Write an enzyme that holds these catalytic residues in place. Sequence first.
Site, PDB file in Angstrom:
ATOM      1  N   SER B 243       0.803  -1.165   0.000  1.00  6.81           N
ATOM      2  CA  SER B 243       0.000   0.000   0.000  1.00  6.81           C
ATOM      3  C   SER B 243       0.866   1.256   0.000  1.00  6.81           C
ATOM      4  O   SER B 243       0.862   2.037  -0.948  1.00  6.81           O
ATOM      5  CB  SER B 243      -1.144  -0.134   1.020  1.00  6.81           C
ATOM      6  OG  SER B 243      -0.700   0.215   2.300  1.00  6.81           O
ATOM      7  N   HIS B 273      -2.487  -8.650   1.715  1.00  6.45           N
ATOM      8  CA  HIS B 273      -2.224  -7.417   2.417  1.00  6.45           C
ATOM      9  C   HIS B 273      -3.342  -7.022   3.389  1.00  6.45           C
ATOM     10  O   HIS B 273      -3.709  -7.809   4.213  1.00  6.45           O
ATOM     11  CB  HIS B 273      -1.907  -6.323   1.359  1.00  6.45           C
ATOM     12  CG  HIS B 273      -1.273  -5.089   1.956  1.00  6.45           C
ATOM     13  ND1 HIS B 273      -0.679  -5.061   3.220  1.00  6.45           N
ATOM     14  CD2 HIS B 273      -1.218  -3.805   1.454  1.00  6.45           C
ATOM     15  CE1 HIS B 273      -0.211  -3.841   3.422  1.00  6.45           C
ATOM     16  NE2 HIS B 273      -0.536  -3.043   2.395  1.00  6.45           N
ATOM     17  N   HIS B 316       4.670 -12.442   8.062  1.00  4.91           N
ATOM     18  CA  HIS B 316       5.022 -11.112   7.731  1.00  4.91           C
ATOM     19  C   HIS B 316       6.302 -11.081   6.826  1.00  4.91           C
ATOM     20  O   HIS B 316       7.247 -11.838   7.002  1.00  4.91           O
ATOM     21  CB  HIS B 316       5.153 -10.270   8.979  1.00  4.91           C
ATOM     22  CG  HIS B 316       5.176  -8.792   8.660  1.00  4.91           C
ATOM     23  ND1 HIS B 316       6.345  -8.149   8.152  1.00  4.91           N
ATOM     24  CD2 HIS B 316       4.172  -7.888   8.721  1.00  4.91           C
ATOM     25  CE1 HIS B 316       5.994  -6.875   7.958  1.00  4.91           C
ATOM     26  NE2 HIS B 316       4.686  -6.681   8.307  1.00  4.91           N
ATOM     27  N   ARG B 325       1.848  -4.662  16.947  1.00  7.32           N
ATOM     28  CA  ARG B 325       0.494  -4.119  16.654  1.00  7.32           C
ATOM     29  C   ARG B 325      -0.581  -5.114  17.216  1.00  7.32           C
ATOM     30  O   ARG B 325      -1.711  -4.693  17.625  1.00  7.32           O
ATOM     31  CB  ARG B 325       0.277  -3.829  15.119  1.00  7.32           C
ATOM     32  CG  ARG B 325       0.712  -2.409  14.755  1.00  7.32           C
ATOM     33  CD  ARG B 325       1.092  -2.199  13.332  1.00  7.32           C
ATOM     34  NE  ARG B 325       1.554  -3.354  12.675  1.00  7.32           N
ATOM     35  CZ  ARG B 325       1.392  -3.441  11.383  1.00  7.32           C
ATOM     36  NH1 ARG B 325       0.790  -2.439  10.742  1.00  7.32           N
ATOM     37  NH2 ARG B 325       1.814  -4.539  10.690  1.00  7.32           N
ATOM     38  N   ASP B 371      -3.244  -8.060  11.460  1.00  7.59           N
ATOM     39  CA  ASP B 371      -4.540  -8.470  10.941  1.00  7.59           C
ATOM     40  C   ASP B 371      -5.272  -9.569  11.733  1.00  7.59           C
ATOM     41  O   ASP B 371      -6.526  -9.638  11.725  1.00  7.59           O
ATOM     42  CB  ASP B 371      -4.539  -8.759   9.435  1.00  7.59           C
ATOM     43  CG  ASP B 371      -4.041  -7.555   8.637  1.00  7.59           C
ATOM     44  OD1 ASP B 371      -3.068  -7.627   7.878  1.00  7.59           O
ATOM     45  OD2 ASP B 371      -4.714  -6.431   8.885  1.00  7.59           O
ATOM     46  N   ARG B 397      -4.305   4.401   7.056  1.00  5.54           N
ATOM     47  CA  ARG B 397      -3.082   4.328   6.274  1.00  5.54           C
ATOM     48  C   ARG B 397      -2.776   5.598   5.590  1.00  5.54           C
ATOM     49  O   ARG B 397      -1.568   5.914   5.264  1.00  5.54           O
ATOM     50  CB  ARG B 397      -3.088   3.117   5.305  1.00  5.54           C
ATOM     51  CG  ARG B 397      -1.742   2.822   4.614  1.00  5.54           C
ATOM     52  CD  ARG B 397      -0.546   2.950   5.532  1.00  5.54           C
ATOM     53  NE  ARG B 397      -0.461   1.969   6.650  1.00  5.54           N
ATOM     54  CZ  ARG B 397      -0.131   0.670   6.585  1.00  5.54           C
ATOM     55  NH1 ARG B 397       0.151  -0.001   5.480  1.00  5.54           N
ATOM     56  NH2 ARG B 397      -0.041   0.035   7.727  1.00  5.54           N
ATOM     57  N   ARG B 417      11.723   4.328 -10.967  1.00  8.07           N
ATOM     58  CA  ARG B 417      11.719   3.573 -12.176  1.00  8.07           C
ATOM     59  C   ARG B 417      12.924   2.636 -12.215  1.00  8.07           C
ATOM     60  O   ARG B 417      13.974   3.021 -12.725  1.00  8.07           O
ATOM     61  CB  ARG B 417      11.744   4.585 -13.355  1.00  8.07           C
ATOM     62  CG  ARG B 417      11.045   4.067 -14.647  1.00  8.07           C
ATOM     63  CD  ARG B 417      11.788   2.811 -15.199  1.00  8.07           C
ATOM     64  NE  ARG B 417      11.414   2.491 -16.504  1.00  8.07           N
ATOM     65  CZ  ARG B 417      11.644   1.309 -17.027  1.00  8.07           C
ATOM     66  NH1 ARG B 417      12.285   0.349 -16.395  1.00  8.07           N
ATOM     67  NH2 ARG B 417      11.301   1.077 -18.279  1.00  8.07           N
TER      68      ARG B 417
HETATM   69  C1  LIG Z   1      -0.688  -6.425   6.941  1.00 12.72           C
HETATM   70  C2  LIG Z   1      -0.182  -6.823   5.835  1.00 12.72           C
HETATM   71  O1  LIG Z   1      -0.820  -6.910   4.825  1.00 12.72           O
HETATM   72  S1  LIG Z   1       1.134  -8.045   5.852  1.00 12.72           S
HETATM   73  C3  LIG Z   1       0.355  -9.631   6.383  1.00 12.72           C
HETATM   74  C4  LIG Z   1      -1.109  -9.757   5.979  1.00 12.72           C
HETATM   75  N1  LIG Z   1      -1.218 -11.072   5.221  1.00 12.72           N
HETATM   76  C5  LIG Z   1      -1.518 -12.228   5.757  1.00 12.72           C
HETATM   77  O2  LIG Z   1      -1.822 -12.384   6.998  1.00 12.72           O
HETATM   78  C6  LIG Z   1      -1.633 -13.333   4.750  1.00 12.72           C
HETATM   79  C7  LIG Z   1      -0.876 -14.541   5.241  1.00 12.72           C
HETATM   80  N2  LIG Z   1       0.526 -14.218   5.137  1.00 12.72           N
HETATM   81  C8  LIG Z   1       1.239 -14.478   4.086  1.00 12.72           C
HETATM   82  O3  LIG Z   1       0.716 -14.812   2.877  1.00 12.72           O
HETATM   83  C9  LIG Z   1       2.725 -14.226   4.269  1.00 12.72           C
HETATM   84  O4  LIG Z   1       3.049 -14.596   5.639  1.00 12.72           O
HETATM   85  C10 LIG Z   1       3.113 -12.724   3.973  1.00 12.72           C
HETATM   86  C11 LIG Z   1       2.674 -12.239   2.586  1.00 12.72           C
HETATM   87  C12 LIG Z   1       2.505 -11.824   5.092  1.00 12.72           C
HETATM   88  C13 LIG Z   1       4.656 -12.633   3.854  1.00 12.72           C
HETATM   89  O5  LIG Z   1       5.029 -13.104   2.565  1.00 12.72           O
HETATM   90  P1  LIG Z   1       6.534 -13.697   2.272  1.00 12.72           P
HETATM   91  O6  LIG Z   1       7.627 -12.705   2.594  1.00 12.72           O
HETATM   92  O7  LIG Z   1       6.646 -14.091   0.815  1.00 12.72           O
HETATM   93  O8  LIG Z   1       6.500 -14.950   3.331  1.00 12.72           O
HETATM   94  P2  LIG Z   1       7.442 -16.126   3.592  1.00 12.72           P
HETATM   95  O9  LIG Z   1       8.814 -15.665   3.186  1.00 12.72           O
HETATM   96  O10 LIG Z   1       7.274 -16.653   4.994  1.00 12.72           O
HETATM   97  O11 LIG Z   1       6.968 -17.233   2.500  1.00 12.72           O
HETATM   98  C14 LIG Z   1       7.632 -18.539   2.536  1.00 12.72           C
HETATM   99  C15 LIG Z   1       6.557 -19.542   2.248  1.00 12.72           C
HETATM  100  O12 LIG Z   1       5.674 -19.630   3.451  1.00 12.72           O
HETATM  101  C16 LIG Z   1       4.308 -19.373   3.027  1.00 12.72           C
HETATM  102  N3  LIG Z   1       3.554 -18.725   4.148  1.00 12.72           N
HETATM  103  C17 LIG Z   1       3.870 -17.532   4.786  1.00 12.72           C
HETATM  104  N4  LIG Z   1       2.826 -17.028   5.489  1.00 12.72           N
HETATM  105  C18 LIG Z   1       1.859 -17.980   5.393  1.00 12.72           C
HETATM  106  C19 LIG Z   1       0.536 -18.107   6.043  1.00 12.72           C
HETATM  107  N5  LIG Z   1       0.005 -17.163   6.747  1.00 12.72           N
HETATM  108  N6  LIG Z   1      -0.160 -19.231   5.712  1.00 12.72           N
HETATM  109  C20 LIG Z   1       0.404 -20.209   4.918  1.00 12.72           C
HETATM  110  N7  LIG Z   1       1.609 -20.195   4.341  1.00 12.72           N
HETATM  111  C21 LIG Z   1       2.269 -19.073   4.588  1.00 12.72           C
HETATM  112  C22 LIG Z   1       4.531 -18.432   1.869  1.00 12.72           C
HETATM  113  O13 LIG Z   1       3.325 -18.369   1.142  1.00 12.72           O
HETATM  114  C23 LIG Z   1       5.597 -19.219   1.083  1.00 12.72           C
HETATM  115  O14 LIG Z   1       5.078 -20.323   0.452  1.00 12.72           O
HETATM  116  P3  LIG Z   1       5.710 -20.480  -1.089  1.00 12.72           P
HETATM  117  O15 LIG Z   1       7.291 -20.530  -0.957  1.00 12.72           O
HETATM  118  O16 LIG Z   1       5.066 -21.731  -1.852  1.00 12.72           O
HETATM  119  O17 LIG Z   1       5.236 -19.185  -1.885  1.00 12.72           O
END
Ligand SMILES: CC(=O)SCCNC(=O)CCNC(=O)[C@H](O)C(C)(C)COP(=O)(O)OP(=O)(O)OC[C@H]1O[C@@H](n2cnc3c(N)ncnc32)[C@H](O)[C@@H]1OP(=O)(O)O
Lengths: 429, 429
Positions: B243, B273, B316, B325, B371, B397, B417
């Site tokens: 965002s 997100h 995260h 948070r 969240d 935000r 860019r």
């Molecule tokens: C507030 C914000 O928007 S940020 C967080 C809000 N989002 C969520 O709660 C959604 C669930 N969370 C996720 O999808 C992730 O934990 C994120 C996007 C927050 C972080 O993303 P990344 O930096 O890419 O996470 P990470 O490095 O731990 O990913 C490694 C693996 O673990 C997985 N993983 C991480 N979090 C989760 C979760 N909550 N549930 C299941 N699997 C997960 C990733 O999808 C990835 O799988 P892949 O290699 O097949 O793609």
Amino acid sequence: ASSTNLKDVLAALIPKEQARIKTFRQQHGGTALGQITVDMSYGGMRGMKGLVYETSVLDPDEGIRFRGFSIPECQKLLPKGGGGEPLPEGLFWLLVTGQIPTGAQVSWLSKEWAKRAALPSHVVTMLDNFPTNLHPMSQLSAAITALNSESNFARAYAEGILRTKYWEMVYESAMDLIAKLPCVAAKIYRNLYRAGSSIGAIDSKLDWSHNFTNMLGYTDAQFTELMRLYLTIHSDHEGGNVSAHTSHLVGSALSDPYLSFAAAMNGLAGPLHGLANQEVLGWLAQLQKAAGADASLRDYIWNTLNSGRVVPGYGHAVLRKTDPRYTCQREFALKHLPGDPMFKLVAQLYKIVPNVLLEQGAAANPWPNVDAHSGVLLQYYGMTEMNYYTVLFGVSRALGVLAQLIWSRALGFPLERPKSMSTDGLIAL
Amino acid sequence: ASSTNLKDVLAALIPKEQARIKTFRQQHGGTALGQITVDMSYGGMRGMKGLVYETSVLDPDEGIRFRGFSIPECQKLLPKGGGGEPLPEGLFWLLVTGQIPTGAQVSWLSKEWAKRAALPSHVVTMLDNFPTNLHPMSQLSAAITALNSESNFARAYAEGILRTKYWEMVYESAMDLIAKLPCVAAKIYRNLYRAGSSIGAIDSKLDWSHNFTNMLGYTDAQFTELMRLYLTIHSDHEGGNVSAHTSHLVGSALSDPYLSFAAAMNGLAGPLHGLANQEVLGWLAQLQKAAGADASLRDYIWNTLNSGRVVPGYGHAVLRKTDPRYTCQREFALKHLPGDPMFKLVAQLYKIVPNVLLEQGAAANPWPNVDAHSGVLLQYYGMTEMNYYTVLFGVSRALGVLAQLIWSRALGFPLERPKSMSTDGLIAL
Ligand SMILES: CC(=O)SCCNC(=O)CCNC(=O)[C@H](O)C(C)(C)COP(=O)(O)OP(=O)(O)OC[C@H]1O[C@@H](n2cnc3c(N)ncnc32)[C@H](O)[C@@H]1OP(=O)(O)O
Ligand SMILES: CC(=O)SCCNC(=O)CCNC(=O)[C@H](O)C(C)(C)COP(=O)(O)OP(=O)(O)OC[C@H]1O[C@@H](n2cnc3c(N)ncnc32)[C@H](O)[C@@H]1OP(=O)(O)O
């Protein structure tokens, strides 16, 4: 058995690419690609190798390439209407698949895009009630964000589909979007510039460009040709440009393709970006307002510079030479509207502007970019509503950002989320 | 002489910062900050130091900081209503200026934000004609994009102002935006959930949060307190989150603040997100649907994982520990709604989820993020419309991305860019 289906082609293509990106990483994931400096950080990532984007690669000297296909090359290899310009349909097949399509493949995107064209009632509504002082890009963007209620990926997601199947809904999403774009765009044009008239309907037998021109109300045969080149050359320009990168960035959080494309247009709409389209025209319009001497033209340029504004349609963050998109347009003008005064004016600036920019010593690239030449082409054909130009750019760009969106999701590209820093922090690092 | 004026404070602050960033660069512009690898490129810039963003810095262990101020610190130092929670107004002053404001400064943003609250007729219109199947974030985003006809920076730009003065119009732009947000947000709520009623008017004497709650129709005194913390803690989270980074990216092309914020929401709206807000609730709602055993809770989590979905509210990209948070919200619940079943359910997951995620061996950070806890707080107070939660996140935000937007422009930050690459290209590099 059977016939044409991008989707079935794509289905054969994904696993191979995946696999191919797997070993690559297994072997070089750790290889340093480059370095990051303070200046790059403060400088908007200038020069930073930061994204993987597949559909197109921009060379700083030679300019854009679709596979490794140059603009002149596409010109030659992509199927035409019947009759000189390349169909944006064929570019699209090219961008998705890496291969040059056959006319028969190309005819398929046409029907397909024609079949999918339809606007929901709420969207039409909103467009009809919008004020005429609401910029065209504004209206386009609010309209595409509002189409997301129709999202096949948004719906699928909420249903809980396995992540391996994302690419499949995205693709439907993208084909539906592309398909709808011209209806939306033409509806805006029509409301704003042809009040009381209607867009009429899409003709399954035409190509996407030709249905667009009809909906826009233009009959000139050569105008259709213009449109076909235009929509093709504006397609894509690697992934680091604001518009594309934005789509990539938002798409990376799982926002559907409607939402990522609409964010992308809020980006295209920036003066420093696609809006340059429009900015050039007004500046040209102002120029002529205040057949001049090279010198008076030059006094004119300094006055802009001195006023702390930019000269529109010149410069580029990556290009180091004249944009082949600009040359391409130039060659179109020389064949079709060589005596046009505005055109002649654009040819004249070309002899002054860069020299003046070299003089000032600030622009890294003093050559014209695509935006410097597109509007003159339009104006000639009777489309003189300059605040509208960027919409055209938008409709084209969809071709590239959406083709890549499908790949990002197919490849499991994750959340775009870099590390930021503060000045204090950096100072202390 | 005279009294309070953020703008006059800002006017004293810009030159110093500028100067300060000048020498810094003159001395370290060339210092390498880090390196870029293939994996980082394929991995969404993970770990890449790529942006300068000033208002907030996220520490991977300790969590977010507003100056160098931690959440608990803000809690203590920011002015309160009279009476426990910190005013998002004061955070804002803090983010812009780097300093802790006085209540008297804080009272000023209140009036100011109250003075500027007003919606144009076209916008109201659009909101009233939108369908109820159009997601709340969709409606918010199309509405803010549609407010850009009112842009003071868009207008100034078109008039040709010198680039040194951008920051000045942006600031008006941002104060007007923040000011309007709650009206827009509440109008959506009201149309979708309280059909036939009206938002009523803004009361110059209240604080921003309290006018929001009234427009939303909530009378519970403790609910107001919730809102004030909520809007404060959701403010900002460094610049690399989708965002914020989006706003930065689009704002960098000179698109006005309305257009950059609306792109930003298309990003907040992604499941990965801000939408997590909403996703958690539904998942919780599903859970309870199918007082359980730790074990049945665990069978439940595996089933999500096994299905190739994410567990919402956990993980995260930057954080390596539990989000402060999340803790912050937890402590609020323990004081006010400790016996709530949903709450108890959220406390229980906290004991299982991370363990299960550690088990699976894929998430780098198995702890809850913001969240995971926000929706339960809302639901308790009677705001059970979960598809709406993200709007609240959006309104908050704005506080951070807009405060930084003003700095980007004040500092002359250029076009974002970066350079992109293809797999073929990379393979060949
Ligand atoms: C507030 C914000 O928007 S940020 C967080 C809000 N989002 C969520 O709660 C959604 C669930 N969370 C996720 O999808 C992730 O934990 C994120 C996007 C927050 C972080 O993303 P990344 O930096 O890419 O996470 P990470 O490095 O731990 O990913 C490694 C693996 O673990 C997985 N993983 C991480 N979090 C989760 C979760 N909550 N549930 C299941 N699997 C997960 C990733 O999808 C990835 O799988 P892949 O290699 O097949 O793609
Ligand atoms: C199609 C696309 O949207 S890309 C091009 C469309 N945009 C334009 O035509 C607008 C005019 N162009 C520009 O503003 C720039 O040339 C851009 C944005 C295209 C490239 O941006 P950058 O990578 O930051 O350019 P560059 O490295 O040359 O900037 C160096 C200096 O020259 C200035 N400069 C570059 N182009 C121009 C121009 N057209 N007019 C005046 N000055 C210019 C830059 O603003 C900068 O000044 P600063 O150091 O005080 O900020």
